[PDB]
Amino acid sequence: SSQPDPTPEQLNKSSQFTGVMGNLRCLYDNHFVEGTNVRSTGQLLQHDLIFPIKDLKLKNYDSVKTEFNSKDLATKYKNKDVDIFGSNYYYNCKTCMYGGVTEHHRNQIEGKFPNITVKVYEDNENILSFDITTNKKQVTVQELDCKTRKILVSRKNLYEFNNSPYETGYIKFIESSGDSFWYDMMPAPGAIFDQSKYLMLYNDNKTVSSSAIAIEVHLTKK
Amino acid sequence: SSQPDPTPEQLNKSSQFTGVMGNLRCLYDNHFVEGTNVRSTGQLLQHDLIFPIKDLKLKNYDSVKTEFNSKDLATKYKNKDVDIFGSNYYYNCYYKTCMYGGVTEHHRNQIEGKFPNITVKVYEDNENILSFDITTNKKQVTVQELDCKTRKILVSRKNLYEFNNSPYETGYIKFIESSGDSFWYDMMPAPGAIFDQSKYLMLYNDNKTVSSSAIAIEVHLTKK
């Protein structure tokens, strides 16, 4: 069904993270891997797929490897023409990511793109609202998350180079049925931030209808 | 008599076409040239005819030149009042816009009352999963007009052609006349990165026509 909302004791405290928050910020303040109608050119293990997505922008990679939480997901998009959108890392890996794959055919939106509203709450107060878009009928939650966080960094300093103005923060997605789930936007405690480990949250390749999804960002101020 | 149905190997594979499928899509997704009771105003060679059909909609052309696979066809409609319906192109049309066939005599061909319902059966991997009807106002209608109308719906409803490529690997449209005689057209582009519109539309240059009240259409596609 759906995931129970977070308890304050269930959320990571940014104040307890002592590393450089800029390592998390760089995963969302910027450009994301993007591929249109591509086909996998190989794979390493039964849980991933490699796509010939070159970086025309900064020339940081000539291909990308994405990982899924199951062999089924990889088998599924193995020989399909797909679209890719997500946050990549180099740390442990050419550049990798997780999930971010949707079937290209029949998924292209014609005409007006859907307006997905993001309601931002600070200490339970709807303080800001903005819309994001997509060109996909069925879009990965990752693409929506990425686009939302980018705006949150640019407009609300969600992540700063050192730490964050917010103690806790989670992004909640609600589908038409009322079913919801959320992601912790803050890093685990300690001085080290493992990017390859954090982005693993996107490996379920979860997708939703772009015209039937609501987003809520809940933050607590320091 | 009739054309043998296509073998899998006789059909173009969209996956082998690397250009922009949108160049083929644009030939069947919007408007088609249409003229009612017009008369040719000239011609360049012996197997074409120019008609004073103006683009009232988008103002993209003041006349149209259509080509046939023979001089006889051009001579036949040269001085007759005709109706025109077809898919036009603008890349390598000198005499504006060009086309192939699409001509039927206007007089005695106008349908009075209820227009015929031409059923289109759509098959995906040999499974009839969808059927829809198209119509026309002509007793004897060109198969170009029927093809055009069918593909337009297929693009709008089944994403037959997308901007990049297509959800279907192979695809052909088959026409069957009352006698059982049939023929088909390959709906997929030739392999490679280039799509020649003027070359593709040549399939309509025989100006083939059929009875609108005695024709069946079948679309056979294979999924990717």
Side-chain angles (χ1 to χ4, degrees), chain B residues 16-33:
Chain B
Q16 298 176 352
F17 168 73
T18 59
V20 172
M21 189 72 81
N23 284 339
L24 164 49
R25 183 181 67 172
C26 68
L27 297 182
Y28 298 96
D29 68 352
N30 53 282
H31 314 305
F32 302 106
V33 173

Side-chain angles (χ1 to χ4, degrees), chain A residues 86-90 92-102:
Chain A
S87 193
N88 62 303
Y89 66 90
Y90 301 90
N92 209 344
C93 109
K94 297 188 183 182
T95 186
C96 316
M97 62 182 303
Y98 294 96
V101 182
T102 47

Side-chain angles (χ1 to χ4, degrees), chain B residues 1-53 55-56 58-74 76-91 93-224:
Chain B
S1 312
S2 62
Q3 183 185 196
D5 275 354
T7 191
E9 303 82 13
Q10 266 165 3
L11 298 169
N12 277 339
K13 275 60 179 203
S14 61
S15 77
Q16 298 176 352
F17 168 73
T18 59
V20 172
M21 189 72 81
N23 284 339
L24 164 49
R25 183 181 67 172
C26 68
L27 297 182
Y28 298 96
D29 68 352
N30 53 282
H31 314 305
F32 302 106
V33 173
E34 285 188 9
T36 290
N37 192 40
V38 289
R39 239 247 187 50
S40 196
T41 48
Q43 78 186 307
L44 182 54
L45 260 36
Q46 287 186 283
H47 64 280
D48 75 67
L49 287 177
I50 293 152
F51 298 93
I53 304 194
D55 190 3
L56 293 329
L58 319 168
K59 289 97 85 97
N60 277 149
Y61 53 84
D62 284 307
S63 77
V64 199
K65 176 171 78 74
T66 193
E67 247 160 359
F68 304 100
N69 66 8
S70 165
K71 282 188 305 251
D72 276 338
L73 277 169
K76 189 202 158 150
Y77 302 106
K78 182 155 186 37
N79 297 116
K80 300 192 165 330
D81 296 320
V82 304
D83 285 336
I84 282 131
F85 192 114
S87 193
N88 61 303
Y89 65 90
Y90 303 88
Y91 260 43
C93 157
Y94 187 91
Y95 74 76
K96 297 187 336 222
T97 198
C98 296
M99 68 184 300
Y100 301 97
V103 182
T104 47
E105 297 180 1
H106 179 269
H107 301 124
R108 308 185 176 180
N109 207 43
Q110 306 313 122
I111 285 177
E112 297 178 2
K114 181 180 180 179
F115 286 174
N117 285 137
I118 303 162
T119 298
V120 175
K121 278 198 218 135
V122 182
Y123 297 80
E124 271 180 6
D125 300 328
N126 214 37
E127 303 274 36
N128 180 15
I129 72 256
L130 174 77
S131 285
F132 58 90
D133 287 354
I134 52 165
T135 67
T136 179
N137 59 330
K138 303 163 181 83
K139 288 179 137 87
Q140 274 298 120
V141 64
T142 64
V143 279
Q144 162 167 12
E145 170 171 344
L146 297 185
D147 195 8
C148 284
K149 289 180 171 165
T150 301
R151 301 213 204 183
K152 182 157 196 228
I153 295 306
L154 292 181
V155 166
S156 303
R157 299 187 66 176
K158 307 301 279 132
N159 283 117
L160 173 65
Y161 302 125
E162 278 158 336
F163 175 84
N164 279 293
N165 212 258
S166 164
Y168 307 100
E169 181 66 329
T170 69
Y172 64 93
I173 182 160
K174 178 186 188 174
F175 299 88
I176 313 94
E177 284 177 274
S178 62
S179 68
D181 283 351
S182 60
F183 51 96
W184 53 272
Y185 297 151
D186 193 330
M187 298 175 97
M188 292 310 169
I194 186 149
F195 180 70
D196 194 342
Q197 288 171 343
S198 70
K199 180 179 180 179
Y200 185 83
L201 289 171
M202 271 185 66
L203 87 163
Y204 297 138
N205 77 353
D206 60 357
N207 209 68
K208 176 83 186 149
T209 69
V210 294
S211 163
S212 52
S213 42
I215 188 76
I217 299 172
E218 292 180 4
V219 174
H220 293 294
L221 323 160
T222 59
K223 303 169 239 179
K224 258 164 199 183

